[PDB]
Design a protein around this ligand. Structure first.
Ligand SMILES: CCCCCCCCCCCCCCCCCC(=O)OC[C@H](COP(=O)([O-])OCC(O)COP(=O)([O-])OC[C@@H](COC(=O)CCCCCCCCCCCCCCCCC)OC(=O)CCCCCCCCCCCCCCCCC)OC(=O)CCCCCCCCCCCCCCCCC
Ligand SMILES: CCCCCCCCCCCCCCCCCC(=O)OC[C@H](COP(=O)([O-])OCC[N+](C)(C)C)OC(=O)CCCCCCCCCCCCCCCCC
Ligand SMILES: CCCCCCCCCCCCCCCCCC(=O)OC[C@H](COP(=O)(O)OCCN)OC(=O)CCCCCCCCCCCCCCCCC
Ligand SMILES: CCCCCCCCCCCCCCCCCC(=O)OC[C@H](COP(=O)(O)OCCN)OC(=O)CCCCCCCCCCCCCCCCC
Ligand SMILES: CCCCCCCCCCCCO[C@@H]1O[C@H](CO)[C@@H](O[C@H]2O[C@H](CO)[C@@H](O)[C@H](O)[C@H]2O)[C@H](O)[C@H]1O
Ligand SMILES: CCCCCCCCCCCCO[C@@H]1O[C@H](CO)[C@@H](O[C@H]2O[C@H](CO)[C@@H](O)[C@H](O)[C@H]2O)[C@H](O)[C@H]1O
Ligand SMILES: CCCCCCCCCCCCO[C@@H]1O[C@H](CO)[C@@H](O[C@H]2O[C@H](CO)[C@@H](O)[C@H](O)[C@H]2O)[C@H](O)[C@H]1O
Ligand code: SF4
Lengths: 96, 154, 174, 114, 115, 70, 97, 97, 318, 51, 83
């Protein structure tokens, strides 16, 4: 009995996994736009906040390469509410 | 005022007399009739009376048997190590007043030379039923305590 | 305040270490190490390592249980020492806490602190990964690879544990 | 070391598919078949370019094909589809195996009409 | 948060019960009442004196066996690997070596307590 | 007789039934009448967070269907 | 290694775990995968004496990915200035920030 | 570096000084050794977890396995030291001066 | 609504524990040809309340020689950790849904051991110390066997999630494919809870009262409450592990009814076993686990690793 | 080279074996009763225990 | 074969626990070799898709690579539907 049920559970897992694969292109497209919007919003705020700082350059890279780098949490949520930062960082780990 | 403390005595008294835990402490013959009170016919446990070996977890000491001079310091010790409130039941002639060894050089003439006694159960030994009568008499003594009523009127 | 969860645990981590490094009675040294194992598990858990965290806590709980038994047999004296009972223990305990406090005070007062080396006090969340949508735990796949990828690691670890039993019996057979 | 080139907020704007995950999960299997071509091209772009900025245009065609997909369901299968994802939505794990009966109704509706 | 809330409530309730237990009852404290218990007669020596462990060798072996579980606990996840030929060999290898270590200590009287 | 032990079992039984019933009811009440969403893996959490944004009322358990597709 | 028996016999005892750009279970990539690969490919075959000098850019970027020291310094600079401007009644954050 | 590293590194240092500055009980020093492994375990785990290097997620586990062997080895020696002198005091281990 | 949920968990537990003491006294009474409490309240129903009130108005004692902080700390851990063991239990929905609920309970149960060690040690009395070191011996006996027994069962479930055990047992109880493990698990839980015939850390007839001989009044009550809360929790865990109740998502109360009956019956069996057998000698407990259960558990562990592979019955990760 | 700090040094044993300590390991002494469930209430059994 | 039987029966009378252990341990080692289902275990583990199936850039000569998920080309899970 345990054999037969676990085979069915493996069949059910694949079905569940295939649904996620079907939606991954849509979620990925949303993720790309959301990250870029957040960074562009971050970039604009940095322009005003650092205006009177002399040596500053707005939107400068720390990397010699021009290749795209995934931003870390501080880079993306650096200038935002604590509860938005908290949910983004520890939301999953803390969820029950 | 008087009404609240009156009910509060009734509650603490009811709990204390409904949950009487004697020390697992027997000395001689009379401890055999103490066993028969725990046995099925009388079933002390049905009244809420439960033996517990540790003095710290005991409310009542039943002095069940002869108290010798050699034993007397030990009996006083475990009595002192009961937390309060605590009660002593003196069971049988030996504990009550030395009994049939009253005139012995090695016997304490009554356990009330060593500890205060609440109830004296006569007999040599008292029947198991007679001891049960003494335990229920101790319960009715506890039912009459007026600790909070007296505190309120201090 | 909650964003600093990992830092607050790390502060209790060090305090536990000062607990047993000051070296009171091993009864209390074991207690200090149990606490550090606990918040040490909490720290690793908050980085996504639930399995790693819970296991270091589990292993150290069994180890200190053996230590407690050995303390009563071989490391006990009439007056076991607490942190307040000895000047050398208290002096070490006090020194470690004051050295811990000041490091905390500056890094919180400034968001950076220099203690031999530069440390950033912006909170530890800033370094976390932003994206994540895999339908599995990464720590679990990495740990589970010990049996497929880590064939060589299993052999050396299995052998060492087997030898450990043989060795301890030789050592203790006077 | 350079100024990261980020697109304008107008170049990022697009019509959003604003439905819950239980809605997406309910239609995932049919959505995978119907919108395969735009989706596969967009995913080929991301794993080749390795840059979200270089794939924006293909990422908009992913949404436009998703909206068209969900617009056809609304025109012909609104009610049967609405029972089905509601059944999915109830489950804490959004399990398929607890909604096989409603999945059928939605499955023969899209077969007969679409 | 929920977990931290749950743990705090549990140990907060326990502490409140202890506080109530210590400040509600009427206390009568004196030396004989608080003296160490030992069946009516004074203790003979300190309870802090060394207490010999007869199962000391089993206790050390527990430390080594108690780490086998950390190596074996990942097995349910390892069963999902593509490389099952290597898995099963290595899983069975570890358990057998653990069994062999147990047999060695058993046959060499390591599990017998010292008298 | 032995069935005089039953009253204490029933009271014990009823006490053990409450935690399971309360949790099931409290979950439904605070999740819009549905089971609480289970997020064991990053993917599930990602979708749950997306639902909170989609809801428009900052609640992952407020669902939006075809009526939100123009 | 001191004795490269692994290369000679062709067995692979521990090289699999040495770098984060190697094959991982289910192809899960490390965060600094691209930076490692660039540095490993820059310095391949030329030796440490040359690599220390001719691959500083690749290594320096890789070090930035690993410890993010330059980034965190930049954020602390931005955050510190906002505190100055917020506290002086000079700048006000927009609703979303 | 990140601020967590400050306290984990400090924790290692505290136990290192703990091990190097002996008192009397040899058991106390064996705890400072288990303290060093605990901090090494934690600090390795943070680095491995944060960087998403999957295959090394087994590394902290292997670290604990060989810490258990050392503790079991250390306790065995403490048994024989105690059986000889009646205590675990380290000042009794000075025959070889 | 979460704080209310926490109180809806722990307050009933303390009520169930209170009435478990009554049920134990009655069940043992009738197996001993007597009645047990039937005076204080009808059928003894008010007896647990009287005992609870009496203890908390009894004078607590701090022994002169005791270590104060550890003396008071120990009962707080005991009750605190006993209640913590319940937060991951799916009944059918857990209060806290953990990925690794099985390992969380293993860690908390290991931590709860120290509430015995430190109470016995802090008491600074010989009978307390002897009881505490029996706890050390008892943990060494069962801990290694207990974890590997769980691992064998989880190889059919595929997860460390407690809720996945409900899904694994949807068509059939796991006691069918694993009754040899259920037997050794059931014994291990008696040893784990210091229950007769393995009630050694207290061991009335040998140690007066063992590790808590110096505890009185409220501090004693916390230890007693922790013990009986652990009895119920470990039988719930046994029921979930081996007697899975089908869960209907639209009628979750039906799960809770069948699930509760199984846990009551398993808890009743603990009382039944206590009335039937003499006590082990504590070195005979060590040999039982290490020389009998451990060799068989190691073999069944290999068997249950291989069986899913050779039958192609490996469960899913989810 | 003799020095005042090494005046108390003796050559090591010929076969490397130092004499066992004359120290007597002390066994725990316990009152088993009289107030004890297994002592019948009036037996003061003084036991010397090793473990 | 007679000497072993006496030993085997002897251990069944003195150490039945250890007889059962070695027997079960022996089966755990042997049966995976002789089982006709062991092959399917790896195939089912292979067929579980944890990752996105990244598409290929069509170059013109990929006859066996499908263009659509529902095309006949590609691995089929029909063996699993009936397992
Ligand atoms: C939950 C809370 C549970 C603990 C409750 C403690 C307070 C209980 C009241 C009490 O202590 O009795 C009165 C007692 C005073 O009565 P006393 O008999 O005169 O005291 C005797 C001596 O003071 C000696 O008294 P002692 O035997 O208690 O020793 C003092 C203390 C040692 O105290 C010290 O030397 C310094 C303080 C050490 C505690 C700090 C944590 C130890 C390191 C772990 C790091 C954890 C960081 C978080 O002992 C300890 O080791 C404390 C361990 C508690 C750790 C709890 C887990 C954290 O304490 C006071 O109120 C003062
Ligand atoms: C599972 C949890 C169960 C918990 C159960 C808790 C008990 C519930 C029932 C409570 C009923 C009231 C109990 C009163 C018992 C008091 C003990 C006693 O009898 O002493 C006699 C004493 C009388 O002493 P006295 O003044 O007459 O004389 C004493 C001096 N000698 C010994 C010489 C005679 O009562 C009192 O002193 C005051 C009575 C108070 C009654 C109301 C309780 C308030 C107490 C607050 C204490 C302040 C600290 C706060 C503690 C936290 C409180 C929550
Ligand atoms: C000497 C005195 C000792 C007295 C003892 C005091 C009681 C000690 C109690 C034990 C403390 C350790 C607690 C460890 C919790 C582990 C539980 C767990 O792993 O799950 C909780 C959750 C992770 O759950 P998981 O499912 O694995 O991953 C998230 C997926 N959604 O993760 C979370 O919910 C986030 C929690 C992070 C904060 C935990 C803080 C623990 C630090 C110690 C306090
Ligand atoms: C010989 C004495 C040994 C003593 C050792 C202790 C043994 C005590 C055993 C106690 C547990 C007994 C089980 C209690 C039965 C209650 C069953 C019930 O009421 O519900 C019906 C149930 C079948 O339903 P269900 O369990 O949900 O289906 C399984 C699929 N998951 O069940 C169908 O029958
Ligand atoms: C015996 C006690 C042992 C205690 C161990 C305590 C923890 C030790 C931490 C070791 C890491 C410290 O790291 C030390 O500080 C920072 C780290 O960015 C570096 O800082 C320096 O080096 C790098 C080199 O590119 C540049 O940033 C720059 O030259 C300068 O900032 C040091 O070159 C490094 O040596
Ligand atoms: C003192 C050291 C002791 C070391 C003892 C080591 C014991 C190891 C015994 C062999 C265990 C594995 O045995 C081996 O398992 C795999 C299954 O995973 C089987 O392999 C079979 O199934 C796999 C997948 O499951 C298929 O890919 C394969 O086509 C098929 O042959 C082998 O036919 C069997 O021989
Ligand atoms: C792969 C997992 C399953 C495989 C089993 C692994 C564990 C094997 C355990 C060792 C078995 C052989 O080793 C064991 O050695 C001792 C010698 O002291 C034998 O003999 C001893 O055992 C029993 C119980 O202790 C005593 O009653 C007997 O007086 C004594 O002679 C055991 O009969 C034998 O069982
Ligand atoms: S009173 Fe009578 S029965 Fe009791 S101990 Fe004395 S002689 Fe024996």
């Amino acid at each position: 009995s345990m054999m037969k049920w676990n085979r069915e559970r493996r069949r059910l897992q694949i079905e569940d996994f295939e649904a996620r694969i079907a939606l991954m292109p849509l979620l990925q497209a949303e993720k790309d736009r959301r990250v870029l919007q957040m960074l562009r919003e971050n970039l604009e705020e940095e322009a005003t906040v650092m205006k009177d700082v002399p040596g500053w350059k707005v939107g400068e890279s720390v990397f010699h390469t021009t290749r795209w780098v995934t931003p870390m949490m501080g880079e993306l949520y650096g200038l935002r509410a604590s509860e938005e930062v908290l949910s983004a960082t520890y939301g999953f780990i803390w969820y029950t | 005022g008087e009404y609240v403390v009156a009910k509060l005595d009734d509650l603490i008294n009811w709990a204390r007399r409904s949950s009487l835990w004697p020390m697992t402490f027997g000395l001689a013959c009379c401890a055999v009739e103490m066993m028969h009170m725990a046995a099925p016919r009388y079933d002390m446990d049905r009244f809420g009376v439960v033996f517990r070996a540790s003095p710290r977890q005991s409310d009542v000491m039943i002095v069940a048997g002869t108290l010798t001079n050699k034993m007397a310091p030990a009996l006083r010790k475990v009595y002192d190590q009961m937390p309060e409130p605590r009660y002593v039941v003196s069971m049988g002639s030996c504990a009550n007043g030395g009994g049939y060894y009253h005139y012995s050089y090695s016997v304490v003439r009554g356990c009330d030379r060593i500890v205060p006694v609440d109830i004296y159960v006569p007999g040599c030994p008292p029947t198991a039923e007679a001891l049960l009568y003494g335990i229920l008499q101790l319960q009715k003594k506890i039912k009459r305590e007026k600790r909070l009523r007296i505190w309120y009127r201090r | 305040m909650m964003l600093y969860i990992v830092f607050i645990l790390s502060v209790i981590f060090v305090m536990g270490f000062v607990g047993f490094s000051s070296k009171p009675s091993p009864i209390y040294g074991g207690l200090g190490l149990i606490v550090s194992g606990g918040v040490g598990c909490g720290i690793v858990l908050n980085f996504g390592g639930s399995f790693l965290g819970l296991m270091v806590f589990l292993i150290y709980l069994g180890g200190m249980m053996v230590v407690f038994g050995y303390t009563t047999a071989m490391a006990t004296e009439q007056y076991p020492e607490i942190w307040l009972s000895n000047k050398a223990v208290l002096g070490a305990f006090v020194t470690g806490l004051l050295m811990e406090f000041f490091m905390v005070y500056y890094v919180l007062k400034d968001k950076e602190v220099e203690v031999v080396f530069e440390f950033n006090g912006l909170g530890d969340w800033v370094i976390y990964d932003t994206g994540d949508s895999g339908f599995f735990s990464e720590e679990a796949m990495g740990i589970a690879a010990l049996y497929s990828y880590g064939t060589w690691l299993v052999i050396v670890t299995g052998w060492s544990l087997l030898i450990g039993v043989v060795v301890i019996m030789e050592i203790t057979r006077g | 070391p350079g100024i990261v080139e980020l697109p304008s907020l107008e170049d990022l704007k697009v019509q959003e598919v604003k439905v819950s995950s239980s809605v997406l999960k309910a239609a995932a299997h049919h959505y995978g078949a119907q919108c395969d071509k735009p989706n596969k091209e967009f995913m080929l772009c991301r794993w080749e370019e390795k840059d979200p900025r270089r794939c924006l245009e293909e990422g908009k065609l992913v949404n436009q094909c998703a909206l068209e997909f969900f617009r056809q369901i609304k025109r012909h299968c609104a009610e049967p589809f609405t029972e089905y994802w509601t059944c999915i939505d109830y489950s804490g794990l959004q399990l398929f195996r607890r909604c096989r009966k409603q999945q059928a109704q939605f499955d023969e509706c899209v077969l007969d009409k679409l | 948060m929920n977990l931290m809330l749950a743990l705090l409530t549990n140990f907060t309730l326990a502490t409140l019960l202890v506080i109530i237990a210590f400040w509600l009852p009427q206390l009568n404290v004196y030396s004989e009442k608080t003296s160490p218990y030992e069946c009516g007669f004074d203790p003979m020596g300190s309870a802090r004196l060394p207490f010999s462990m007869k199962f000391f060798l089993v206790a050390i072996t527990f430390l080594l066996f108690d780490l086998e579980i950390a190596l074996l606990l990942p097995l349910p996840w390892a069963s999902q690997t593509a490389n099952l030929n290597t898995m099963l060999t290595m899983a069975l290898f570890l358990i057998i070596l653990l069994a062999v270590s147990l047999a060695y200590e058993w046959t060499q009287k390591g599990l017998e307590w010292t008298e | 007789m032995w069935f005089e032990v039953l009253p204490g079992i029933a009271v014990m039984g009823v006490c053990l039934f409450i935690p399971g019933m309360a949790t099931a009811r409290i979950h439904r009440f605070s999740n819009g009448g549905k089971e609480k969403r289970v997020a064991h893996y990053p993917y599930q959490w990602y979708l749950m967070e997306r639902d909170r944004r989609v809801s428009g009322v900052n609640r992952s358990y407020v669902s939006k269907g075809l009526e939100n597709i123009d | 290694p001191f004795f490269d028996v692994q290369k000679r016999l062709g067995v692979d005892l521990d090289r699999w775990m040495t770098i984060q750009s190697a094959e991982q279970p289910h192809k899960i990539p490390s965060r600094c995968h691209a930076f490692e690969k660039e540095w490993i490919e820059c310095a391949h075959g030329i030796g440490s004496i040359r690599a220390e000098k001719e691959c500083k850019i690749e290594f320096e970027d890789f070090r930035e990915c690993l410890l993010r020291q330059k980034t965190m310094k930049r954020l602390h600079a931005i955050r510190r200035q906002r505190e100055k401007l917020i506290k002086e009644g000079k700048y006000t954050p927009p609703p979303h920030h | 570096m990140s601020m967590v590293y400050m306290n984990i590194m400090m924790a290692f240092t505290v136990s290192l000084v703990g091990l190097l500055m002996y008192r009397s009980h040899l058991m106390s020093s064996l705890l400072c050794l288990e303290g060093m492994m605990l901090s090494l375990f934690v600090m390795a785990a943070l680095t491995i977890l944060n960087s998403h290097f999957t295959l090394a997620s087994m590394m902290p586990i292997i670290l604990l396995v060989f810490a258990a062997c050392e503790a079991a080895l250390g306790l065995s020696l403490l048994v024989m030291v105690s059986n000889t002198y009646g205590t675990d005091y380290v000042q009794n281990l000075n025959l070889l001066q | 609504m979460f704080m209310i949920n926490i109180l809806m968990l722990i307050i009933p537990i303390l009520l169930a524990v209170a009435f478990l003491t009554l049920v134990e006294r009655k069940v043992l009474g009738y197996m001993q040809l007597r009645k047990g409490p039937n005076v204080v309240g009808p059928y003894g129903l008010l007896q647990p309340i009287a005992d609870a009130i009496k203890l908390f108005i009894k004078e607590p004692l701090r022994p002169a020689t005791s270590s104060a902080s550890m003396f008071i700390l120990a009962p707080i851990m005991a009750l605190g950790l006993a209640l913590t063991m319940w937060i991951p239990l799916p009944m059918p929905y857990p209060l806290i849904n953990m990925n690794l609920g099985v390992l969380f309970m293993l860690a908390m149960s290991s931590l709860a051991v120290y509430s015995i060690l430190w109470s016995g040690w802090a008491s600074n009395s010989k009978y307390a110390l002897i009881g505490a070191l029996r706890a050390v011996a008892q943990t060494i006996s069962y801990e290694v066997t207990l974890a590997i027994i769980l691992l064998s069962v989880l190889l059919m479930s595929g997860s460390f999630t407690l809720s996945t055990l409900i899904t694994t047992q949807e068509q059939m109880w796991l006691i069918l494919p694993a009754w040899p493990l259920a037997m050794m698990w059931f014994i291990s839980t008696l040893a784990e809870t210091n229950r007769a015939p393995f009630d050694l850390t207290e061991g009335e007839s040998e140690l007066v009262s063992g590790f808590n001989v110096e505890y009185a009044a409220g501090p004693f009550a916390l230890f007693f409450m922790a013990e009986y809360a652990n009895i119920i929790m470990m039988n719930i865990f046994t029921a979930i592990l081996f007697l899975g109740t089908s869960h209907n998502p639209h009628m979750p109360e039906l799960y809770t009814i069948n699930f509760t009956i199984k846990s009551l019956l398993l808890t009743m069996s603990f009382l039944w076993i206590r009335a039937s057998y003499p006590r082990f000698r504590y070195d005979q407990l060590m040999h039982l686990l290490w020389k009998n259960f451990l060799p068989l558990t190691l073999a069944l562990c290999m068997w249950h690793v291989s069986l899913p592979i050779l039958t192609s019955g490996i469960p899913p990760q989810t | 080279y003799p020095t005042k700090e090494t005046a108390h040094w003796k050559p090591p044993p010929w076969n490397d074996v130092d004499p066992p300590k004359d120290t007597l390991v002390s066994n725990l002494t316990l009152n088993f009763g009289p107030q004890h469930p297994a002592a019948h209430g009036v037996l003061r059994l003084v036991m010397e225990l090793s473990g | 074969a007679e000497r072993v039987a006496a030993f085997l029966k002897n251990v069944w009378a003195k150490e039945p626990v250890l007889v059962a252990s070695f027997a079960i341990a022996g089966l755990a080692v042997i049966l995976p070799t002789l089982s006709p289902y062991t092959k399917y275990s790896l195939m089912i583990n292979r067929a579980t898709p944890y990752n996105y199936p990244v598409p290929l850039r069509d170059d013109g000569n990929m006859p066996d690579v499908p263009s659509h998920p529902q095309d006949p080309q590609g691995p089929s899970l029909e063996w699993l539907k009936r397992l």
